[PDB]
Symmetry: C2
Subunit: 268 residues, 2 copies
């Protein structure tokens, strides 16, 4: 026939070549209103992260952020609770954009309003400059991750981490449910026994947009997520769903979830 | 300390390689007799000699590392009923597909199409030539020449010819991988099938505007030894002294070779 074959490309190929860090930041993290859907969701995620790392007992020596993207908002409360942080993504472009903020390059994104907000949550025991530096000192490594591989960070020499965080990544990274489950088990290989898994992601979202550019997403409901996490050797401590969805022009999600789980797996 | 990122050359390539910058900077074929135009002229004549005058012909040709370009196919569609185009970059194949579909955003190849029609004796005008290429190109696939099955587990019939222009140097970070890649491409070929390769000599990088990429700097002796070792018999091998502009690459000439898979 003609054009009757699979191109052979995968989601991660399309992601690596098409995903634009600076656009994603323009569209998802610059707000013309503070009551916009995107702004509301960001604030919610920040409050949960504050609760987990500051109020709940989630702290330690090493945190690994899986699928950081080009953002640092998901690390601002974490750097109070973790000596060292490792940031990762499948896109080197995302990591370059992130590194610009780490090195405080002038072209870096302006996170200062998000910083202010987190300083408020924490009760203004520091101002933004001091907090920003604490994060800059905390981040030690900038690495490729591939959650589909049994060794997501390669054969790199990393000690077992106290926490693996992943915000708005796993849905986009996994083309089917078996992959999702395997990925969660693969992330386990980075963790100490009894270590924390922290996940926030969209529910029932099959796509996300950056301008005219469309990306695939695995549309999971809460039951699928819970089942997959359990089956991958974690015990869920809590699981929150919010109804607040993204604008239809960005995603077709029916809310987001947040969970904190612990690795039961103790490979001898 | 500080660890390595983990990203490979093919990650970097897939991530950063911009089809349209490559087309702008390399294949404009403008008024100024640039080094890039002189090189393009030479490739076109060699391809014509190989496919039209010589007897490299058959049913199936697979182009490895097509990129966003069609210059390497213009003579080949006279000799082959079917052609498969491949690249590790989906961006490249998207730009190529724009041309194949005659979308208006497509690159203007007509100066190059004109040149080739001239070579071939003006048997046809450009539009008919372009239509003949469009009918010939059947599939658009990912390739990864570092894999023992470069086009995946797709059911493809054994090919009569494997073409690869300006690809393998860029695709392979070491000589062992280069040898293996030629071995891998062989899996696509019939015994006695043709392997056509054109690439830069002693080139360690290339520029796509502001973006720099790695390439394997190979001398002619390395290339010939690697091809023999990979299980081919070389019919002929040509070198030209003409290099790219310093602002684009640091090569000491190009090579063309035609080899056959050992029957
Ligand atoms: O480890 C892997 C392996 C394969 C792979 C394939 C595609 C994408 C990613 N992700 N995905 C991300 C993040 C980067 C930042 C943006 N999110 C997507 C955000 C949308 C927002 C709307 C709701 C759905 C999530 C994705 N980082 C990534 O590395 C992959 N990660
Ligand atoms: O099959 C593979 C597997 C891994 C891999 C990694 C990097 C690059 C490529 N190539 N390389 C190309 C072409 C696409 C079109 C541009 N040329 C580079 C052109 C320069 C010009 C100056 C002289 C050196 C070559 C490269 N297409 C590719 O797919 C790779 N191909």
């Amino acid at each position: 026939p003609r054009g009757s074959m699979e191109s052979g490309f995968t989601s991660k190929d399309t992601y690596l070549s098409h995903f634009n860090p600076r656009d994603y930041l323009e569209k998802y993290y610059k707000f013309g209103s503070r009551h916009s859907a995107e702004s509301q969701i960001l604030k919610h995620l920040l409050k949960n992260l504050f609760k987990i790392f500051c109020l709940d007992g989630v702290k330690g020596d090493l945190l690994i952020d899986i699928g950081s993207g080009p953002t640092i908002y998901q690390l601002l409360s974490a750097c109070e609770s973790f000596k060292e942080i490792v940031v990762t993504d499948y896109s080197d472009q995302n990591l370059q954009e992130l590194e610009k903020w780490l090195k405080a390059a002038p072209a870096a994104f302006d996170w200062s309003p998000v910083v202010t907000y987190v300083c408020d949550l924490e009760g203004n025991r520091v101002k933004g400059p001091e907090k920003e530096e604490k994060l800059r000192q905390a981040v030690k490594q900038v690495l490729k991750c591939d959650v589909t591989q049994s060794q997501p960070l390669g054969a790199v020499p990393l000690p077992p981490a106290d926490c693996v965080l992943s915000t708005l990544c796993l849905d986009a990274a996994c083309p089917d449910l078996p992959t999702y489950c395997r990925a969660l088990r693969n992330l386990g290989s980075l963790l100490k026994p009894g270590g924390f898994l922290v996940i926030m992601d969209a529910l029932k979202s099959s796509y996300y947009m950056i301008g005219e550019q469309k990306f695939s997403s695995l549309p999971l409901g809460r039951e699928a997520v819970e089942a997959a996490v359990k089956e991958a050797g974690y015990t869920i401590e809590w699981f929150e769903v919010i109804s607040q969805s993204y604008s239809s022009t960005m995603a077709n999600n029916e809310g987001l979830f947040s969970l904190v789980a612990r690795k039961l797996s103790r490979p001898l």
